[PDB]
């Protein structure tokens, strides 16, 4: 179909652009934090971990751009086929669960400002972020194992694909990818940011007697849904097609195209998260200004 | 009546100013056209000390050039081995709001004080093998801005109360009070011979004192604003005044005049602290900029910048051998430079 020809023509440019902005943003974050090497805030621990996760996340995109150029005829070795898609599923989990960890800490820090004064947060922060990097590594092992180069006879290409050994792995893939990757952290993010926003509404209500933060807190949930809901929606339609709960030429054309567009669109998260979680803050902007004052 | 004394004071102030300008035959900056500049001092953070929980107010090197004291708003007084960074002692203070500390020339004792108006003396060499307060001197009616030992038995002190005082530490009592200032005294340094000391105050003036007499021998008035810091030039014949309004000035007693001001259009922050290298050529000054920068007293122009801190450099000390300079700052790291 024409749409695939168009996709092969244009989608590498979109991928390369999202890669470029992702590298630029996350490198800028990492620099402005780590250039004054010796110390960081507890918030900056999570934010630096997040910027690193989104950096390594977009680091795999140029290979996929140069795979869609060459028309999905995977140019690289079978090992790189395992490694790239492994680090891309790992950093999906690590980035998403780090924005969970941020929203949790931010809840503890803004809804309980005194108890989070007494609690030893910085230890829990280091432990949590490195535990997330570990568990996100481990949850990627299934991708390292099952991703393999195979011929696709309908297309006359060798493509880097999941050689899923049994149909049970479709249920395992969809349960882990939609429920753990999108659905559980969405629910946690919405819980924490609701309790935050309700507390800041109460603070504003009392303060007025004698809205940027609400805009940012809603922008977190909006950006998360905009990035991740389209892909996990198409992934759900794919799983339904593997169940043949949906069936026909329309569905297979729609799903297969949408998975590509939505998947590479989801990498916009690596570009938006530096903006929303870092660049908008007055503190960060002063930290830029004062490290421009020490060129 | 009193207007006649005020007129006599004005007349004597004019006579003194006349004598000051009658001495001012030729200035040091021109005389040093015969000699090379220092050039760029590329000082680097040889060691960083990172124990203090909150901002440093003060330091003092030990006479061994090996140990140093540091005092911080957290109420810790820490003695550092600067060679190893070993914390040789950590002393909990009776009051968190310390502003000054000193190490005795023998190292038998350390002292500190601040908004408590009390100079606490701690014995480091007890039979108990631990640090305990030996005495607390409690005669000042205002915060202690600086105190420094003359001897294991004598400590000079200065205060917000607009006075300085010399204590007998065994007696626990003021032996002499120095009272001719007219604002908060901010800083002291003993002359090398220890027979004199200089005090600077919020009145924008400096005064020379004889510890054996209690008399103000001399007053110096050049600064336009509050003076934060004093150090004797190592010859004991001159001293540098670090003040608000972003200026250092060097005075010589025998000249009775400001020899030089060290200034630059770029610097707006006040001087927090000053000290000299063992030759006296480098004058080193701390600033509100979170930066401290280093000056050549003969060329009267700056020769290096340390810039290692991120909140203002509050205190600055050079070893008695001159092998290192150390700088404490509001950021609680204490950095050693060579």
């Amino acid at each position: 179909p024409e749409a695939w020809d168009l996709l092969h023509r244009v989608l590498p440019t979109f991928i390369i652009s999202i890669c470029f902005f992702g590298l630029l943003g996350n490198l800028f974050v990492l620099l402005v934090f780590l250039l004054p090497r010796r110390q960081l805030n507890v918030a900056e621990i999570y934010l630096a971990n997040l910027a690193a996760s989104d950096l390594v996340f977009v680091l795999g995109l140029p290979f996929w751009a140069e795979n869609i150029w060459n028309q999905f005829n995977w140019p690289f070795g079978a090992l790189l086929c395992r490694v790239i898609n492994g680090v891309i599923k790992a950093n999906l989990f690590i980035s998403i669960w780090l924005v969970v960890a941020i929203s949790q800490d931010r809840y503890r820090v803004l809804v309980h400002p005194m108890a989070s004064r007494r609690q030893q947060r910085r230890r829990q922060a280091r432990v949590t972020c490195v535990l997330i990097w570990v568990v996100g590594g481990l949850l990627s092992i299934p991708t390292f194992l099952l991703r393999s180069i195979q011929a696709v006879p309908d297309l006359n290409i060798t493509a880097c694909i999941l050689l899923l050994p049994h149909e049970a792995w479709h249920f395992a893939r969809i349960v882990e990818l939609n429920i753990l990757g999108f659905l559980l952290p969405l629910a946690a993010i919405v819980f924490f940011n609701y309790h935050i926003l309700a507390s800041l509404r109460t603070r504003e209500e009392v303060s007025r007697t004698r809205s940027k933060t609400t805009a940012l807190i809603l922008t977190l949930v909006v950006a998360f849904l905009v990035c991740w809901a389209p892909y996990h929606f198409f992934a759900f339609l794919e799983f339904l097609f593997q169940v043949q709960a949906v069936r026909g030429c329309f569905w297979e054309d729609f799903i297969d195209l949408g998975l590509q567009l939505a998947n590479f669109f989801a990498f916009t998260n690596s570009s938006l998260n530096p903006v929303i979680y870092v660049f908008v803050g007055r503190l960060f902007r002063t930290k830029v200004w004062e490290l421009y004052k020490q060129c | 009546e009193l207007d006649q004394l005020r007129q006599e004071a004005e007349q004597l102030k004019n006579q003194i100013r006349d004598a000051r300008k009658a001495c001012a035959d030729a200035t040091l900056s021109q005389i040093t056209n015969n000699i090379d500049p220092v050039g760029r001092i590329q000082m680097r953070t040889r060691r960083t000390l990172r124990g203090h929980l909150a901002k440093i107010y003060a330091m003092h090197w030990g006479t061994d050039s090996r140990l140093l004291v540091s005092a911080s708003q957290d109420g810790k007084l820490i003695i550092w081995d600067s060679y190893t960074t070993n914390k040789v002692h950590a002393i909990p203070l009776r009051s968190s709001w310390v502003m000054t500390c000193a190490y005795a020339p023998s190292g038998n004792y350390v002292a500190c004080g601040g908004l408590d108006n009390i100079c606490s003396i701690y014995n480091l060499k007890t039979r108990e093998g631990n640090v305990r307060v030996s005495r607390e001197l409690a005669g000042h009616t205002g915060y202690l801005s600086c105190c420094r030992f003359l001897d294991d038995n004598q400590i000079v002190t200065s205060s917000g109360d607009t006075t300085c005082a010399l204590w007998d530490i065994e007696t626990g009592q003021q032996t002499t009070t120095f009272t001719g200032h007219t604002g908060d005294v901010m800083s002291l340094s003993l002359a090398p011979d220890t027979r004199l000391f200089v005090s600077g105050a919020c009145d924008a003036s400096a005064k020379l004192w004889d510890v054996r007499e209690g008399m103000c021998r001399q007053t110096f008035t050049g600064h336009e604003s509050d003076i934060n810091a004093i150090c004797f030039f190592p010859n004991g014949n001159a001293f540098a005044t670090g003040s608000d309004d972003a200026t250092c000035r060097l005075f010589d007693l025998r000249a009775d005049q400001e020899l030089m001001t060290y200034s630059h259009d770029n610097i707006i922050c006040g001087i927090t602290s000053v000290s000299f290298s063992k030759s006296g050529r480098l004058l080193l000054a701390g600033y509100d900029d979170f930066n401290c920068n280093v000056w050549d007293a003969l060329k009267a122009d700056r020769a290096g910048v340390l810039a290692g801190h991120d909140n203002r450099v509050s205190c600055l000390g050079v070893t008695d051998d001159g092998m290192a300079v150390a700088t404490g700052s509001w950021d609680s790291f204490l950095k050693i430079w060579n």
């Binding site: 803004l110 | 929980l53 950590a90 601040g114 408590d116 009390i118 000042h140 205002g142």
Partner: protein
């Protein structure tokens, strides 16, 4: 590696362990500075809060609310030129400024003192809790006294009360109008120089009233919340 050098490092590690204990105490304790004229109930505030629980230049009172420990520092037998010793307190979580709202003669000088605090370079990030104290004396004076605030602040004759809270045990609108005009003067001074980096939290109080500890806790909670927002780049 000498056994003496080992002994030195061992002593150092013992001290570092002690400082590691002491780091927790310092981070958990909140530090406050009282400021206020002798007309203010400052001494009676520290007296009542200590009950709630020499020429020494500073008085620490230590009190606890909701398991948060407060060190409140009060300053006495210092010379009146506050300009230098105030620089110490740049770390403090909040200043409390306490005012005799009833001494109209001194109230303009207290307004100048508050302006001096609020504008001070070192304090441009420290929020000020403001206790307009001796409020009952102000009520008595407005109700029954011949003295009128218009004798000292002529703008009061133009001033009319906003939409306003009043106690459920009601009060004469004259008392409310006076009360709110004084608060308006202080809050106005606060808003004229603020960048929003620091906030003024006015309250009306009596030295006797036991709610001052709770007020201080709630406003420290808000100050810490605003710091946490700035740290999380969320403001």
């Amino acid at each position: 590696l000498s056994a003496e050098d080992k002994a030195a490092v061992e002593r150092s590690k013992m001290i570092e362990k002690q400082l590691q204990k002491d780091k927790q105490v310092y981070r958990r304790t909140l530090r406050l500075l009282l400021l206020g004229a002798d007309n203010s109930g400052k001494s009676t505030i520290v007296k009542q809060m200590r009950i709630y629980h020499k020429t020494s230049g500073i008085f620490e009172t230590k009190f606890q609310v909701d398991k948060v420990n407060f060190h409140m520092f009060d300053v006495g037998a210092q010379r009146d030129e506050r300009r230098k010793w105030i620089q110490c307190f740049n770390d403090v979580t909040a200043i409390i400024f306490v005012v005799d709202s009833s001494d109209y003669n001194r109230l303009q000088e207290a307004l100048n003192d508050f302006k001096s605090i609020w504008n001070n370079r070192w304090l441009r990030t420290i929020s000020v809790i403001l206790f307009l104290n001796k409020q009952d004396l102000l009520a008595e004076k407005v109700l029954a006294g011949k003295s009128k605030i218009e004798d000292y602040f002529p703008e009061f004759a133009r001033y009319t009360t906003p939409e306003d809270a009043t106690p459920e045990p009601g009060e004469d609108p004259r008392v409310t109008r006076a009360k709110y005009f004084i608060r308006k003067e202080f809050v106005d001074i606060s808003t004229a120089s603020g960048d929003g980096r620091h906030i003024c939290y006015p309250h009306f109080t009596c030295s006797v009233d036991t709610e001052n500890a709770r007020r201080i806790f709630n406003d420290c909670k808000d100050i810490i919340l605003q710091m946490n927002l700035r740290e999380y780049n969320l403001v």
